[PDB]
Amino acid sequence: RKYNYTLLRVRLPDGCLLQGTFYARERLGAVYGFVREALQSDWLPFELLASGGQKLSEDENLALNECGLVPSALLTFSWDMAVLEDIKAAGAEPDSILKPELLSAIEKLL
């Protein structure tokens, strides 16, 4: 009987950690929407990998308590392979994942 909410963290390629609060029954589409709003480029396709090695699909209507992400979990962030090939081929270093609007309020972990 211990839990009905979950806290998620996302490990970003640029060394930053993104955190947010969700219902234990929330769907994966709301987590992808949350991350898109936090990203510098909300349109740029990406994937979120769960702590158990299972990839989370944005188009799959699964709940966080069904995906093994409750009461808490860390997700691994990666851009879609299609855009990574163009970013690397062009010589563009993806050194910023999040929007400056959130980064200006970055806190240290304790």
Binding site: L49, A50, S51, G52, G68, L69, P71, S72, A73, L75
Partner: protein, 712 residues
Amino acid sequence: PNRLIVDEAINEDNSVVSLSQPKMDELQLFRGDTVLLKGKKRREAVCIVLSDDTCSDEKIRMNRVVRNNLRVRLGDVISIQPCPDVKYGKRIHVLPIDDTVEGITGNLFEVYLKPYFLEAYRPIRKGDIFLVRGGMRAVEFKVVETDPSPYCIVAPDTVIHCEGEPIKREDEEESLNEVGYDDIGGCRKQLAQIKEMVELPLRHPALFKAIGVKPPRGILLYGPPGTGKTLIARAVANETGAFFFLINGPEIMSKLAGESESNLRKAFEEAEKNAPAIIFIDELDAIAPKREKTHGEVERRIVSQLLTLMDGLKQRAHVIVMAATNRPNSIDPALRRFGRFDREVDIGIPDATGRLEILQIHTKNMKLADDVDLEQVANETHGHVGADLAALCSEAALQAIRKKMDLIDLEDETIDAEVMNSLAVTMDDFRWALSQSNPSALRETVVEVPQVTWEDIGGLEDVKRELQELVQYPVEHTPSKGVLFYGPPGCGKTLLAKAIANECQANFISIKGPELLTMWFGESEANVREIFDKARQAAPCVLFFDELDSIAKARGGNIGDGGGAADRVINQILTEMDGMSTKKNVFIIGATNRPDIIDPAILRPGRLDQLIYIPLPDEKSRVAILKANLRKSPVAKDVDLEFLAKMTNGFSGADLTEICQRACKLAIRESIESEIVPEIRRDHFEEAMRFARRSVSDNDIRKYEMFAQTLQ
């Protein structure tokens, strides 16, 4: 604070450990976060933390690979220190360990390291040793260079390099292919019993050196060959760190007088020098046979030397002696006196679950095809022990090897890793091996949890509750430890004993008429004591003595020879029952179809104090019986089971089953003939009704009802 006791892993993966969620909440880390673990000798390791429903609040679950990198052992304590600063690596250089790369060549990265790390995001620290399984070989690697330091997370964009000679293992490092606790399948309870008795004096010797009270000096492991008697002894020594000395009968008996006893006592002296240590003596019946069976001086004197060496263990602190035999009664009884080898464990034969676990252990390095179903194999391999399942996996591998190697034709000192990587073992290869394998433990009784549950028994709703209360009451709140069932045959007497064992997850020990008769006929009724001792070792279990009067009937029943109601075996059963306590977690159930001629002693206080009558099923029960028997088959909607039950007024449950099987057989025959219908139709049941008859007469019911009223 922030410290936990090291325990066994549930997830075998080498990059993850499991904590109880309340400790992850205190450390404010989430599932998947990367943490450092602080071990002994100022060593550390990096891993991912998850949680489960089984880890103790004050323990950390980690596998052998993680413990070896920390140079810690089960029972130690480590600190947990989250390290969120870890970043992704750019280049990591990994090289194999020489001890595992011999006879194999090719590109180890493409076969092992690449799929191991690909999209796995495993934490890696410089100096880490880890195992990658595949190609029927277990190959472990060490990390020699990391661009970030001292640890990082591997990413799909991280460069993985591997050039150079294999690395030699350090003398303080153990091979990951050495037998440990993760290599033992079934008999988990027996292993836990050894842990309680052995690990404490070896991990915490100070507790026993400060006091004059010695721990158990010897443990006798007995059971069929190939069940893990030596595997447990070695695994315990390897996990605790105690020195393991191997002795066996033939090695000592092959020596001449003087040399034999010298080698035996020399090993004991070495164990003290290397204490803590475990001395394992295999084939105890060969080194210490019963003296009345031999006139040789060598055999008698070796027993005398072993008897004194066991007594000397009160001086040889922290040395524990274990031995293996086939049966506790096949060795010189002097060894079993107070002290010495006064403690024994019955290993037994793994059940279907244990056999599956053993197969899964052996196939760890095997590449299996999608059609391979090891659970189905474990269900078919009745009578097999771990030694036979090892042979089964080997033979299945060899058949797969021949099929491909005939086409590969690689003749050299080593085999390419690539050709082994593409080699898979299919169900056809296991099926072939099953046809060639022959169980080594088919003669011994196999005892396991039955598959019969309460939903398989029609009627008798009150008897179901009575049995559940008899077992639950002494656990939830002198309670009885046994019940006698009487009544007509074919009403479920045996099923009741199995169903209560099933729901309790208890072992079911089935004794049938032929076994009771065998003991009587051969004047070997002393074997009853072994049956009761098995019931204790198998606890929790249900000890079911069917056909209690089978011997009385064999001796005449209604006429009679030189005996009457009592016999050699029932008197031994009565004797042994008086020695069993209600706290032994053994429930004794009897059954008879003629309760008027069974020695009434069995119902006297302290024995089978519960007495339950099982009548023929009534109309609603007969319908339930038909539905239970048909629960596994397609049945047409035109089948009126209530109509059948109304007609079969005098039928037993066994008689209703015959009707069901008759209709089933007819449905199958019709389907076969049509192909050369897909469900059982009323016509098949109506035909069965023309031949099925009641097996229990009205006169037999009156006999049982009169008995019931006589005893109340």
